[PDB]
Amino acid sequence: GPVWRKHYITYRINNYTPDMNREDVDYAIRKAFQVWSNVTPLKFSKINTGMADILVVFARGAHGDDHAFDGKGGILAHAFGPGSGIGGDAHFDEDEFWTTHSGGTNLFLTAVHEIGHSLGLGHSSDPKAVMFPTYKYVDINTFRLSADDIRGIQSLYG
Ligand SMILES: COc1ccc(-c2ccc(S(=O)(=O)c3ccccc3CC(=O)O)cc2)cc1
Ligand SMILES: [Ca+2]
Ligand SMILES: [Ca+2]
Ligand SMILES: [Ca+2]
Ligand SMILES: [Zn+2]
Ligand SMILES: [Zn+2]
């Protein structure tokens, strides 16, 4: 599938969930990108204006991309594979309650998974992979990609 054909990738936080402190949104997203820069040649930079490669959006219900969100539960987030325009973008359902911890839905863990899609990864059948289709909290301070995730991302980059 499509992959970014450049090493410097930009993101922008379009808007911020009221569920969290701003600095904690910034940090969770930054750390999630770092999970992937750690195992690829990719470098990620947050920009504050202009067109980023990866636009990060919190939105609810129908939000302009034909993939409406569904209220609390169910779909938590989705992201588009590499490409121009909407490609790469990562959208988080505002009807979830995003957090820095095990309460609500953990934004960092969700973003690691979504960014994997923004980089071109699909889903893994391994429950230990971050790219497994199902959300489950794991301690975020000791989080590590599975061997399956590493094999997937290194099949695309590096
Ligand atoms: C700890 O690793 C994680 C594993 C999975 C996810 C995760 C993120 C999103 C979703 S989801 O929005 O409910 C979803 C459910 C079914 C199909 C597609 C999605 C979106 C998606 O997988 O990106 C489901 C799971 C998030 C983190
Ligand atoms: Ca939802
Ligand atoms: Ca984009
Ligand atoms: Ca919310
Ligand atoms: Zn969307
Ligand atoms: Zn997914």
This structure's resolution (angstroms)?
1.3
DSSP codes, 110-133? HHHHHHHHHTT----S-TTSTTSS
Could you list the residues known to form a binding site for Ca(2+), using ranges. 19, 53, 70-71, 73, 75, 85, 87, 89, 93-94, 96
Give the Å distance between the CA of 22 and the centre of ligand 4.
Answer: 13
> 114, 115, 130, 152: which is the annotated catalytic residue?
114
Domain segments of the chain: what residues?
A: 1-158
List the CATH code of the domain at 1-158. 3.40.390.10
Q: How was this structure determined?
A: X-ray
User: Using CA atoms, how far apart are residues 79 and 97, in angstroms rounded to an integer?
Assistant: 18
User: Using CA atoms, how far apart are residues 126 and 129, in angstroms rounded to an integer?
Assistant: 6
| Tokens representing residue 105 in the block | 């839905």
Instruction: Name the 3-class secondary structure at 70.
Output: coil
Query: What sign does the CA torsion over 48, 53, 55, 56 have?
Result: negative
Atom of ligand 1 nearest to the CA of 137: 1
* CA angle (98, 52, 5) in 5-degree steps: 110
Asked if 95 and 66 count as a contact pair (C-beta separation under 8 A), the reply is no
Could you list the residues known to form a binding site for Zn(2+), using ranges. 63, 65, 78, 91, 113, 117, 123
- Tell me, using a 6 A CB cutoff, whether residue 77 lines ligand 1: yes
User: Using CA atoms, how far apart are residues 118 and 89, in angstroms rounded to an integer?
Assistant: 6
User: Using CA atoms, how far apart are residues 74 and 57, in angstroms rounded to an integer?
Assistant: 18
